[PDB]
Design a protein around this motif. Structure first.
Motif, PDB file in Angstrom:
ATOM      1  N   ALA A 118       0.828  -1.201   0.000  1.00 55.16           N
ATOM      2  CA  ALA A 118       0.000   0.000   0.000  1.00 55.16           C
ATOM      3  C   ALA A 118       0.865   1.255   0.000  1.00 55.16           C
ATOM      4  O   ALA A 118       0.589   2.214  -0.719  1.00 55.16           O
ATOM      5  CB  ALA A 118      -0.899   0.004   1.234  1.00 55.16           C
ATOM      6  N   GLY A 119       1.918   1.238   0.810  1.00 51.71           N
ATOM      7  CA  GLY A 119       2.816   2.378   0.891  1.00 51.71           C
ATOM      8  C   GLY A 119       3.498   2.605  -0.445  1.00 51.71           C
ATOM      9  O   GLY A 119       3.757   3.741  -0.830  1.00 51.71           O
ATOM     10  N   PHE A 120       3.779   1.515  -1.149  1.00 52.96           N
ATOM     11  CA  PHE A 120       4.427   1.606  -2.448  1.00 52.96           C
ATOM     12  C   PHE A 120       3.515   2.305  -3.455  1.00 52.96           C
ATOM     13  O   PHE A 120       3.954   3.160  -4.219  1.00 52.96           O
ATOM     14  CB  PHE A 120       4.777   0.197  -2.950  1.00 52.96           C
ATOM     15  N   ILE A 121       2.252   1.931  -3.453  1.00 53.86           N
ATOM     16  CA  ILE A 121       1.304   2.527  -4.381  1.00 53.86           C
ATOM     17  C   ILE A 121       1.112   4.012  -4.094  1.00 53.86           C
ATOM     18  O   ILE A 121       0.781   4.782  -4.993  1.00 53.86           O
ATOM     19  CB  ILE A 121      -0.036   1.800  -4.281  1.00 53.86           C
ATOM     20  N   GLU A 122       1.287   4.406  -2.834  1.00 55.79           N
ATOM     21  CA  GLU A 122       1.092   5.806  -2.436  1.00 55.79           C
ATOM     22  C   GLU A 122       2.387   6.621  -2.499  1.00 55.79           C
ATOM     23  O   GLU A 122       2.396   7.737  -3.018  1.00 55.79           O
ATOM     24  CB  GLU A 122       0.566   5.843  -1.001  1.00 55.79           C
ATOM     25  N   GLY A 123       3.469   6.071  -1.943  1.00 53.72           N
ATOM     26  CA  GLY A 123       4.761   6.771  -1.908  1.00 53.72           C
ATOM     27  C   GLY A 123       5.801   6.098  -2.800  1.00 53.72           C
ATOM     28  O   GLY A 123       7.000   6.197  -2.546  1.00 53.72           O
ATOM     29  N   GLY A 124       5.346   5.425  -3.853  1.00 50.68           N
ATOM     30  CA  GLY A 124       6.276   4.771  -4.774  1.00 50.68           C
ATOM     31  C   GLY A 124       7.365   4.012  -4.022  1.00 50.68           C
ATOM     32  O   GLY A 124       7.141   3.475  -2.943  1.00 50.68           O
ATOM     33  N   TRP A 125       8.552   3.979  -4.601  1.00 49.62           N
ATOM     34  CA  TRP A 125       9.671   3.286  -3.979  1.00 49.62           C
ATOM     35  C   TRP A 125       9.837   3.697  -2.512  1.00 49.62           C
ATOM     36  O   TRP A 125       9.726   2.865  -1.604  1.00 49.62           O
ATOM     37  CB  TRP A 125      10.954   3.601  -4.746  1.00 49.62           C
ATOM     38  N   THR A 126      10.105   4.978  -2.285  1.00 49.69           N
ATOM     39  CA  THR A 126      10.291   5.486  -0.930  1.00 49.69           C
ATOM     40  C   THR A 126       9.155   5.038  -0.023  1.00 49.69           C
ATOM     41  O   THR A 126       9.354   4.817   1.174  1.00 49.69           O
ATOM     42  CB  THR A 126      10.347   7.018  -0.957  1.00 49.69           C
TER      43      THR A 126
END
Length: 24
Positions: free
Chosen positions: A7-15
């Motif tokens: 989920a974090g990836f989809i929102e904050g990409g790689w970081t």
């Protein structure tokens, strides 16, 4: 966690992936 990373990836990409992985 694993989920937070996805989920974090989809929102904050790689970081976002890293942030979700560590969570805190």
């Amino acid at each position: 966690g694993l989920f937070g990373a996805i989920a974090g990836f989809i929102e904050g990409g790689w970081t976002g992936m890293i942030d979700g992985w560590y969570g805190s």
